[PDB]
Amino acid sequence: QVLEGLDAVRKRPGMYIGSTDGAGLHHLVWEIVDNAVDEALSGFGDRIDVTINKDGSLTVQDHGRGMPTGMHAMGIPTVEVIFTILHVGSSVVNALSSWLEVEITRDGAVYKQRFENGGKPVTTLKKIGTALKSKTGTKVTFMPDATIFSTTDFKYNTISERLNESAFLLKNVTLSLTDKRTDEAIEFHYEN
Numbered sequence: 461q462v463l464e465g466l467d468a469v470r471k472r473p474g475m476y477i478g479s480t481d482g483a484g485l486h487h488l489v490w491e492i493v494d495n496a497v498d499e500a501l502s503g504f505g506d507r508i509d510v511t512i513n514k515d516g517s518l519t520v521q522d523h524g525r526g527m528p529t530g531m532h533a534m535g536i537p538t539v540e541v542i543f544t545i546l547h548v549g550s551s552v553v554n555a556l557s558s559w560l561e562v563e564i565t566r567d568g569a570v571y572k573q574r575f576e577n578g579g580k581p582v583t584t585l586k587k588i589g590t591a592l593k594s595k596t597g598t599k600v601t602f603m604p605d606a607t608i609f610s611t612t613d614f615k616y617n618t619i620s621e622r623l624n625e626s627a628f629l630l631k632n633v634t635l636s637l638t639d640k641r642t643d644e645a646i647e648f649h650y651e652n
């Protein structure tokens with residue numbers, strides 16, 4: 461199992477997301493969302509909010525345990541290792557983004573790390589605020605790299621159908637989609 465840097469993704473994006481068109485662009489969304497969905501499936505968090513921001517970036521927020529805020533080796537945060545070393549989905553999104561921010565809430569603290577220009581960290585994982593102890597979760601916002609994708613326009617209907625399906629499969633978890641470009645919004649939630 462050979463590890464690689466993010467440059468490897470940027471030179472062969474098709475090998476990781478299939479293509480650099482609309483399909484590839486939306487694969488980025490699926491990778492980020494599936495991380496939140498996997499957490500909910502494990503029983504952590506009961507809503508997942510997706511937002512297409514007006515500047516074209518996309519946000520996904522869950523309310524699960526929150527990614528580990530501890531240190532890996534050499535003072536490098538565990539979360540930074542996940543976002544910068546290719547083994548998988550998260551580092552691929554980071555590599556193919558002109559910028560990305562991850563915000564973790566847990567243990568009464570809020571932490572943030574920002575990456576730019578293909579996943580280069582411009583900050584470390586720093587505490588930016590506090591919260592109630594009961595508050596937990598992970599939020600990731602990324603801007604897809606326009607120098608790589610032939611289109612960086614997220615399609616509301618495409619994402620809506622995917623989130624609907626993920627909601628039907630998950631059960632008892634609310635998934636929302638909000639389009640700040642057009643004010644459109646919808647929510648999905650299935651019982652059992």
Ligand SMILES: Cc1cc(-c2cc(NC(=O)c3ccc(C(=O)O)cc3C)[nH]n2)cc(C(F)(F)F)c1
Pocket residue numbers: 491492493495496499520521522524525526527528550562597598599600
């Ligand atoms: C939207 C989003 C959510 C998440 C994420 C990850 C978590 N949780 C874990 O990574 C997790 C939490 C706790 C424990 C533990 O053993 O206590 C383990 C893991 C893997 N929740 N949400 C991760 C990402 C990711 F992968 F960074 F892109 C994106």
